[PDB]
Amino acid sequence: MQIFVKTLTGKTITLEVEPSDTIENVKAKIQDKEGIPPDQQRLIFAGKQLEDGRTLSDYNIQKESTLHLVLRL
Amino acid sequence: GSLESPGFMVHKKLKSMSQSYGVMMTGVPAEVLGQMQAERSIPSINKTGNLKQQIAKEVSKVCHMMTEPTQSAGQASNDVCELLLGKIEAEKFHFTKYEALSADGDNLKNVLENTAPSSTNLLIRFEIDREDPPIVLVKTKNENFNPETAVKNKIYLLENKLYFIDKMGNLFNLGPGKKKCTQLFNAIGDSAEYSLCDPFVLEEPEKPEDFAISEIVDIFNEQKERFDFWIGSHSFTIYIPQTLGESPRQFYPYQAYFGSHTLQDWFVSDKDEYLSRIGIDKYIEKLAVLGKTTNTKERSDIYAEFFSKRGREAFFCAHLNEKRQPLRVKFKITEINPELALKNLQETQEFIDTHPGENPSDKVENYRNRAKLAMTEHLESLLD
Amino acid sequence: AGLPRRIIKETQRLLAEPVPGIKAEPDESNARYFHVVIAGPQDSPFEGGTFKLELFLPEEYPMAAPKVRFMTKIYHPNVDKLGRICLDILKDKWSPALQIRTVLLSIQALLSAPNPDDPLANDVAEQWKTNEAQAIETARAWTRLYAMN
């Protein structure tokens, strides 16, 4: 499936993922698309902080969902 | 008293504007920021509660996340690249492949010695990876083990196999035969998950379970080379402007660091100038040691000296923050057109000047208040 | 027997050789709790004060980090409203390679050098970052009020 990642600056990124992909695999996809190392980024969905070990289905992220890239700790 | 080069004027303007204006350097209207943060924060608001008060509680809590400049080292490198290259050439630079810094860093030095200091303006972007090996061993029955659904980045001990599933899902047979695996499987207890990095079992084994886990750790270490544990960890840039005449070549490092500081804090602290004073050769040499050493203290010290918030070098990579895993330094290099970079900086200053206010502080405060008001308004609109 | 051999060994090693400037003793009710006293670091705004802490080893230690909270009030950007402290590991994560002693040294170091840009108390960290001198003086004042007895 395809998902979106938005930044505070308005930018939207599109990613091809599977539901068994971990959050860490998603961060590495963002790295390949934007040059942001996985350690320097957090992800948000429905106001929840995602953990690297969990999967997209562990959070019920389905097709065309929108995550938010957070670039401040 | 001649004039500095255009290439050096890029550094001076980038440093000065970033000190003064901060978060405004992105060139993104405050309204965009506020609306995006409203969209991030709308789930936290309970629609049956007090709406006005929940909105003001949310706005005053996530203010800094909005109106402070990024701490992402990656986003900071992107910002620098876009200012100095422009959007198009920065996209082409991003799809350029990273090179590994050699053991003594002579490949970077060699590139630098074949460009005349007077003829070019260089931008170098670095990425540091850290090893993140598996830390858990799972003892499971073969009948309960399906590689397609098993959790990734773990070592798995079955009755008859020893497998490693890496971060991406690759299945590696680690090699021991069935009798060895029967030995290891039955030497270990019934807790299911065991640690691969517990110094009390690895250095003070007292029961066969400890010795079996230790044998597994050794089997894994002896073939580490088959695997890829690298994960992208840090990012930064070095700018080398052209010199004029016989003047020696200077370099300036730029970075942000997650949970530590912004590019603006970096410039305000003048750590760019401080590291500049050691010279590019010394800098590359210590980068190469960082990527090559097996010693934790040496690794931690170089990392702290180079990447810490100024004034925290003594604590940055100490104790819990020690750098206990190997690191890998990668780089890519491109030429800078200083005319274009100065135009992007002037266009950003024109953006900044559209904000009412007399001193930089006043325009920054206009920007922040606009972001807060746009977020309050967009939340009010989303809640109808 | 009662507690895992790693907790028993760490406890006895801590008691035999304490961390300079840190008293750390297990509770007699439950040995997974440690009563800790950390002396305010020299040259820091907490100099002079003694700060009590509770350190808890969850059931899954050492795969889960210890849980540490201040029992003495403190004006620190990395202590939250309930006194809890985050262990402040940037671009890495907790692992059983780390120990109780490493945790204790890290807490002592965060006293010696607060980190406003990884805050648990956003207001305290903001006042730490804009008016550093004001936050330092406030820290000295709270050391006077709550940390010197």
Domain residues of chain B, as ranges? Answer: 1-132+230-384, 133-229
Helices (H) and strands (E) in chain C, counts: 4, 4
According to DSSP, residue B109 is labeled H
**At B239, is the secondary structure helix, strand, or coil?**
strand
Residue B315, phi-psi category: left (phi > 0), alpha (psi -120 to 50), beta (remainder): alpha
Residue B302 near residue C73 (C-beta atoms within 8 A): no
Residue B166 near residue B228 (C-beta atoms within 8 A): yes
Which one, of A19, A20, A62, A66, lies nearest residue B167 by Cα?
A20
Separation between Cα atoms, residue C7 and residue C13, nearest integer Å: 10
Beta carbons within 10 angstroms of residue C45's beta carbon: 22
Could you give the angle at which helices B280-292 and B296-307 cross, rounded to 10 degrees? 140
Technique behind this structure? X-ray
Question: Which residues on chain B are in Cβ contact (under 8 Å) with A38?
Answer: 231-233
According to DSSP, residue C108 is labeled H
Count Cβ atoms within 10 A of the Cβ of residue B10 and give its class: 0-12 exposed, 13-18 middle, 19 or more buried. buried
Cα distances (Å, whole numbers) of residue B247 to A4, B6, B37, B119, B279: 49, 15, 48, 12, 13
Domain residues of chain A, as ranges? Answer: 2-70
Q: What resolution in angstrom units was achieved for this structure?
A: 2.5
Beta carbons within 10 angstroms of residue B38's beta carbon: 25
The chains found to touch C (3+ Cβ pairs under 8 angstroms) are A, B
Which one, of B242, B240, B189, lies nearest residue B213 by Cα?
B189
Q: Quick check: B260 and C6 CB within 8 A?
A: no
Domain residues of chain C, as ranges? Answer: 1-149
Separation between Cα atoms, residue B119 and residue B76, nearest integer Å: 27
Question: Which residues on chain C are in Cβ contact (under 8 Å) with A73?
Answer: 117-118
Look up residue A23 and give its amino acid. I
Which residues touch C25 (CB under 8 Å, ≥6 apart)?
C15, C34, C35
Residue C38 near residue C51 (C-beta atoms within 8 A): yes
In the CATH hierarchy, which fold is given to the domain comprising A2-70? Ubiquitin-like (UB roll) (3.10.20)
Residues 257-286 of chain B whose Cβ lies under 8 A from any Cβ of chain A: 258-259
**At C3, is the secondary structure helix, strand, or coil?**
coil
Cα distances (Å, whole numbers) of residue B220 to B243, B317, B374, C96: 51, 27, 54, 18
Residue A61 near residue A22 (C-beta atoms within 8 A): no
The DSSP bridge partners found for residue B239 are: B123, B252
Residue B43 in contact with partner chain A when CB distance is under 8 A: yes
Count Cβ atoms within 10 A of the Cβ of residue B301 and give its class: 0-12 exposed, 13-18 middle, 19 or more buried. buried
Separation between Cα atoms, residue C55 and residue C5, nearest integer Å: 18
Cα distances (Å, whole numbers) of residue B329 to B31, B99, B129, B266, C123: 38, 9, 7, 21, 37
**Six token digits for residue A48:** 């929840």
Residue B268 near residue B69 (C-beta atoms within 8 A): no
**At B165, is the secondary structure helix, strand, or coil?**
strand
